[PDB]
Design a protein around this ligand. Structure first.
Ligand code: ADP
Ligand code: ADP
Ligand code: MG
Ligand code: MG
Lengths: 460, 466
């Protein structure tokens, strides 16, 4: 009766597509679109390239409701040896490195490929040309779910005359355009508003074409790989850090070199609290001494914040400008908080508030959520951002009536966003994140008070 | 600058524990408790055994806030050779078959084990004796994250002089008792109310003990493994089915032998609609033919409903009894609907309504969600159940004011529950399930409508006397 069996990562997601954001054809179409766009953006702005991204969705089969999604970008491309695994091996990524990107699981595109395979028979099509490559490399791929490995259906190359570079991805999937339409449009519009150095073109299944022109040629400094912040690094992470050392570091040397925010004196203070010999060889840490390091990191109250430069923010100015373009308010304000850390990861919370003007009258605020520059559209009431907004008492900040015109926007960015599911539509209840979102909203809420106070004496 | 790497299933969950319901210490404590409890129930009532479950949570270290969770059951135990993979290999399960169980990913207990070693240094402790085994096998285990394999730290054996069968699992993890407390108690109380054939004992970190006595000695008929129903079976699944074949079946034989609700006549019609040659050997099906089968499965309107043999319901009588006991309403009603299918999986929705009486007054219903007899506690407003309850027009069913006292209960059971996350706290928006939940709710709301029309009519008669 009990037969014990194993699954591959590919079989796991094929059996549970709702875990990756593929619960139904409408959400699947939306998910496939944003995974491709986010890959294209990670392939451009992370590498100092002004993104030029084209999105096409065609209805291929009316009766069967199969759509072909094609995204083309001018990004860094993919080395041809890596393409099969990049697109056809679940849990394969170039972004497992400690660095702020949109992608993070090494699942995304493969979830769409699995969903594609589940329901129709055309392979995914990849065309790619790395910087300086004299060839465009072409592929048609499927995934062997049992082995979790790519099946190469076609593989070829052509000479690249108009010597340009980037990647085109096309995937055919079940979809529901009429149901996904408003959200696909909103996803692209919100991305665009916060990514003014990007240019998008969107051709939809009805044949509408929408142009989103570049507004500036200045890209924010690209996020880089950074060292972990000590606060919240766990025991398994300590072991990984040790196992990856080239040099025979002592524990002291380990602390100042492998982490952010640890100078020579901070190192000493930690080693004392943790009860570790500074000169002992870190390769020799016992199971117990690792426990003592981790607990010390967790308790130490005098850690400097991580470098803000670790991350890529939207910015106070862009945030306020955005709130004025869309909402045409009587008042807006924003803050880009100083960095904090959670589980070894630097993060910044930004928050913005708008009030009055063309903002609809309602019983709750309109809440706008972003994480690593991605607009979140689904599952809003499950989000920690919504929880904090809900729990805050807006009467303590001027909100007189139970009916008001208010927009609240929160952006979380980090080397790691803790999402509730691999679908990445909502942020989990991580304690340090929840507290800082609350502190951030309070700062901007105080500014709203100062206005609603001055504005009240006018009616008085 | 880009370096490509892979992760094992263990490293995946270790890097992202929030995906398996381990976002913070409070929720970790709650998740660990509920994973152990569900495994214990799956080891007992799935095999016809009346569950006796003991849960203890001890505070081991006040400063580090480490708690040791221990759950002991009288289940079937585990063959000693399977113990290391069962607790220490991510994506390893005895329940990847077509049968209703609480467990479903082969993740749960390992996610607790990972959280355990990420934060403290004591191995998890397993003690087990299978049915009829002369021995009690003990294990201490860790996981090698990189390889996704068990490390046997200690392994031992002892003579089972008392004929005991079952398992004890004990795991030390960071926790937060004061924040997790009310939900852990509510989880246990909720499961007990719908599992009256079980007995629980719960000792909490404060040294409080609660006893939940068995109220009936009848066990529901255990769910059995069944063949897939054709409706919604996808292409990869068709391939899996073909590949597991030990015979050289024709397509016709494949259809009649591999599925529920297909006999000779239904097969003939399916072969006709799909444009498939009945005599062709199914091992030779082309990619395009598989697509045709699948679409035909998807559009065929004459399939018989699946049996409920693979399912285990709470049942109308118990739903109503439980609603009355807890809420002391003026009215309650319930419905256990007929089975349907989605994605090849038989499913049943049960619904319950309670109104008035001891129910608190509020602006919205109290919603009680269950999946495969597990009470769902967190993330309620993301649940498809919430979505359906919220969109229903309660004025159409006699709910006059903006304020009322109502409880609504929905249980989905199936060989596969589509949760939104591996933490299994909310059900995703799958169309077939959404429609049937709406249907069930409407059937139970019509019963409420009737109660309230009765009350109104009497008031109207009484108004004339004024
Ligand atoms: N358009 C693209 N341009 C360059 N690289 C890409 C592109 N699309 C996908 N990739 C590569 O494929 C890998 C796997 O992508 P994905 O499955 O979506 O996971 P993730 O984005 O989380 O790493 C990425 O890490 C990236 O290296
Ligand atoms: N208390 C128990 N009694 C019997 N078997 C157990 C017990 N706990 C765990 N198992 C076995 O270990 C396997 C892995 O459990 P778990 O990681 O929770 O995944 P899942 O429950 O989805 O199968 C189970 O399928 C079950 O066979
Ligand atoms: Mg991606
Ligand atoms: Mg389980």
């Amino acid at each position: 009766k009990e037969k014990f069996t194993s699954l591959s990562p590919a079989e796991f997601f094929k059996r549970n597509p709702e875990l990756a954001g593929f619960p139904n054809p409408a959400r699947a179409l939306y998910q496939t679109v944003r995974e491709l766009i986010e890959n294209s953006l990670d392939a451009t702005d992370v590498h100092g390239i002004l993104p030029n991204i084209k999105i096409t969705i065609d209805l291929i089969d009316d009766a069967r409701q199969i759509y072909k999604v094609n995204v083309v970008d001018n990004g860094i491309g993919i080395p041809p040896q890596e393409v099969p695994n990049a697109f056809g091996r679940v849990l394969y990524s170039s972004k497992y490195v400690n660095r702020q990107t949109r992608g993070m699981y090494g699942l995304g595109v493969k979830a769409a490929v699995l969903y594609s395979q589940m329901h129709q028979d055309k392979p995914i099509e990849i065309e790619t040309s790395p910087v300086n490559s004299k060839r465009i490399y072409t592929f048609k791929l499927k995934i062997d779910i049992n082995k979790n490995e790519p099946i190469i259906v076609e593989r070829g190359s052509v000479e690249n005359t108009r010597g340009f570079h980037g990647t085109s991805v096309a995937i055919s999937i079940p979809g529901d355009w009429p149901k996904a339409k408003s959200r696909i449009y909103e996803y692209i519009k919100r991305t665009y508003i916060i990514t003014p150095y990007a240019e998008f073109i969107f051709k939809d299944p009805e044949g509408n074409v929408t142009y989103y022109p570049r507004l500036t040629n200045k890209i924010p400094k690209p996020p880089q790989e950074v060292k972990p912040h000590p606060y919240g690094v766990d025991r398994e992470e300590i072991k990984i850090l040790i196992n990856n050392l080239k040099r025979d570091y002592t524990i002291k040397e380990f602390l100042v070199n492998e982490f952010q925010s640890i100078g020579d004196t901070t190192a000493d203070k930690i080693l004392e609290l943790a009860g570790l010999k500074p000169n002992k060889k870190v390769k020799n840490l016992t199971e117990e001494e690792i426990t003592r390091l981790v607990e010390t990191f967790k308790k130490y109250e005098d850690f400097r914040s991580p470098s803000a430069d670790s991350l890529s923010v939207i910015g106070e100015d862009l945030i306020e400008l955005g709130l004025k373009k869309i909402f045409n308010p009587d008042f807006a304000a924003s803050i880009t908080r100083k960095p904090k850390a959670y589980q070894g990861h630097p993060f910044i919370v930004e928050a913005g508030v708008a009030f009055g003007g063309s903002i609809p009258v309602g019983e709750e605020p309109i809440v706008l959520r972003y994480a690593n520059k991605i607009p979140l559209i689904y599952d809003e009431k499950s989000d920690v951002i919504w929880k904090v907004v809900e729990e805050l008492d807006w009467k303590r900040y001027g909100i007189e009536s139970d009916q008001y015109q208010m927009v609240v926007m929160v952006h979380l960015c980090s080397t790691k966003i803790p999402y509730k599911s691999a679908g990445k539509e909502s942020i989990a209840e991580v304690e340090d994140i929840e507290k800082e979102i609350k502190n951030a909203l309070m700062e901007v809420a105080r500014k709203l008070k100062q206005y609603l106070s001055e504005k009240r004496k006018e009616q008085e």
